[PDB]
Symmetry: C3
Subunit: 320 residues, 3 copies
């Protein structure tokens, strides 16, 4: 199934792009293609990593999210970037953790734990989300654009520093070849993807928010980290947990700060400004994760809980 | 005392209703009557339950709340329904748990624990409250009524499913007779109670919110679960805790979803839309409960803490 | 260094006040002086305390905060009072705990714990902050001034009662002499400090909020409790933790209620009304504290986390 979706994806995505027919179906072709490419992009990142390993983990483990957002910045579609960063933490904490706890929840009794790590990894989540996303949002309302992105830059610079500082202290040959392949393919698909967003909104009626928080996030970040759902089935939950939380952590502490600083160069800037639904969805998820990482790691319904929360948010983001 | 308040209550409530004198005192007569009826309604529900036991626990354990809200929907007084559902979680988490921890707090040393269950029961509370009440509220502001109650219906359908799924997996003869008696009596009292609400507001100056969140909630849900305060005195705290949290859980996951779906039939619908004070009171209580269920189960001041929070909210709901 | 800042401070503060030159530099002279005086005020409070000990701990341990706010009330500058009470919990939870966890974080392995106390002290924090500061704020929007300060008075009266009730149940000669000295000196410096606030705002461009939440709070409360940073270095973390959380607790439960009731006498009243940034900064800090008090008590980066949160808030309060 993984090979088929790539082998069909790229050709179709080339021909559709060349023919320019039509604006609607091109979206559907792009999204499915990148899903397949993203898993392979995650497997290559994983296999390469199995000191500098953490850097490639934060860079290439979130690469499609970085890539899609990069071209979104060129088109000035800064809302979608924020939407996708919102949706990347949602997916990690509620979908790729939810499906790991549900699908891997056939073992039934309990699940692999490192209580020390789970309780420490919530300690950073709160810091990452409940401060460094909440604080800029609420402080920014009556700030003015200059001070807005200065605070963003301020938070962004310290979040990468505090992420990289802890990181500094605390087959293999095909990995680089396939990673170099998938990247460029994705990049070229992503460039044309950004131009599709305005038509999809009008023709379907969907809000650009829905597209960003859900469609772009599932395809991009969530697919890259779908290795955790498989890892949960092979009774290695503590890594499936480690992947979900860790990825979210680097999205909040590295990826989002990366985007904010780099957005200042072209054309011009995006501050860490999240809508109310986007913000409260993120904290609720974080709280629900701390409330689920504490207890038994998993159960079928415990994963169903995390999933129930997601679909609700998703349909809420659809209905706005 | 329990027999007297029923024996005086019903007759008085019949004569006052027939005489139609006056609109003000009828309220006072109704409320006191139902208090007495509700404890007996809780005792019958308990005795009947001591697989299907969980259904009658969620149905008849919250029956007066369902009954008062049912006729409130017929009068179109949808605000009071939301107010009473707000006040049912408040009472459970802060009053009937607060008085269990205070009155039963004469033991002094510690109190009956099941740390596994308390930590798991917070995990669902957050899901139930901090997502499935918060998310609909904040997402709904700029949604439009169609999408509003569609999201409500959406959340409602999955919350009952997720509640009933876990429930499916995981003297006695007088119980049904007294339960069948109390129900009908309550129902007929409740029908006439709803019509009293508009006059009480005007003549006293009270907001309909105050009446719903406090007066209706204490009389209805809190009285039904007052068995926990007695159970705490008999040094069985872990059931007094189990009652408070469990009841709140089924209010958020079964009762409130029940009301939302059924409200669509007559005349027309109520979405899960809570005011700001109603919403933030509910999360604060939930957080304070997790902060108090973790530590020693009880102490006198630990129960006084939970009670101090309540009276504050109550006078705040009075002063709005 | 401690002697020099007092010995230079008072004289300079006398001469500058007499000469009336200028409005700008007088601020700088006052603030530095009180920093030095406040540590000595904390040492005297500590040495006196090492039943009634808890009263002097809550009174004189927060004395400069009480003193600066007292004269702020006379000038009617009620915003600064709320700003400084906001900043006193911020500092305690993020600065004086952050610097204790960072500077004392050279031990490296772990740090002194009393998990029972830390988990209990969060239980009151949530109550103190997430209810008794949040609830009055959100409930007050559409209340009217009469009901506003009535709710404040209501919350204030029960918070001191609930604080004093638990307290009731549960060199030395120079201490009183130096405490009596520092108080009067501070009081006279503070009186002239309040009059400086309006010019500093205009001439620098700073918001009076920034001054209150940060400048007044660091100088006042944070300096008094800087003993904890030293105590962390002497490998006595559990007292450095006890100081930070305890002080915050008495600020929320005694100091702030003290100010509210006493403010009603002159000239007229201040309700517990906090701006949105002030409120969300306080809960985020509290959450981050619970997320950091749970795990290892300290690590260098764990203290750097708490500090990173602070500077962000601080620059956000600067940029508003």
């Amino acid at each position: 199934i993984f090979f088929i979706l790539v082998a069909a994806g790229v050709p179709l995505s080339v021909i559709g792009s060349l023919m320019h027919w039509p604006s609607a179906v091109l979206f559907a072709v792009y999204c499915v293609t990148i899903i397949a490419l993203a898993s392979y992009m995650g497997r290559a990142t994983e296999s390469l990593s199995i000191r500098i390993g953490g850097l490639l983990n934060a860079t290439f483990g979130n690469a499609v999210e970085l890539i899609i957002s990069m071209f979104a910045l060129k088109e000035g579609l800064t809302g979608i970037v924020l939407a996708s960063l919102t949706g990347s933490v949602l997916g990690n904490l509620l979908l790729v953790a939810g499906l790991s706890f549900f699908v891997g929840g056939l073992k039934y009794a309990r699940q692999e734990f490192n209580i020390h790590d789970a309780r420490h990894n919530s300690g950073l989540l709160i810091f990452a989300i409940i401060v460094a996303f909440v604080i800029p949002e609420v402080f920014s309302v009556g700030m003015g654009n200059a001070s807005k992105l200065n605070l963003s830059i301020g938070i962004s610079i310290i979040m990468i520093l505090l992420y990289v500082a802890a990181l500094y202290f605390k087959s293999g040959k095909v990995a680089t070849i396939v990673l170099f392949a998938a990247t460029i393919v994705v990049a070229y698909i992503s460039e044309n993807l950004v131009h599709t967003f305005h038509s999809v909104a009008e023709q379907f009626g969907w809000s650009e928010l829905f597209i960003g928080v859900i469609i772009v996030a599932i395809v991009g970040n969530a697919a890259e980290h779908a290795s955790a759902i498989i890892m949960a089935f092979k009774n290695k939950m503590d890594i499936a947990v480690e992947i979900a939380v860790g990825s979210t952590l680097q999205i909040a502490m590295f990826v989002a700060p990366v985007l904010v600083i780099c957005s200042i160069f072209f054309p011009t800037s995006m501050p860490l400004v999240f809508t109310l639904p986007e913000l409260v969805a993120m904290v609720s998820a974080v709280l629900l994760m701390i409330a689920i990482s504490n207890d038994g790691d998993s159960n079928w319904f415990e994963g169903a809980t995390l999933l129930a929360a997601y679909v609700i948010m998703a349909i809420g983001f659809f209905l706005l």
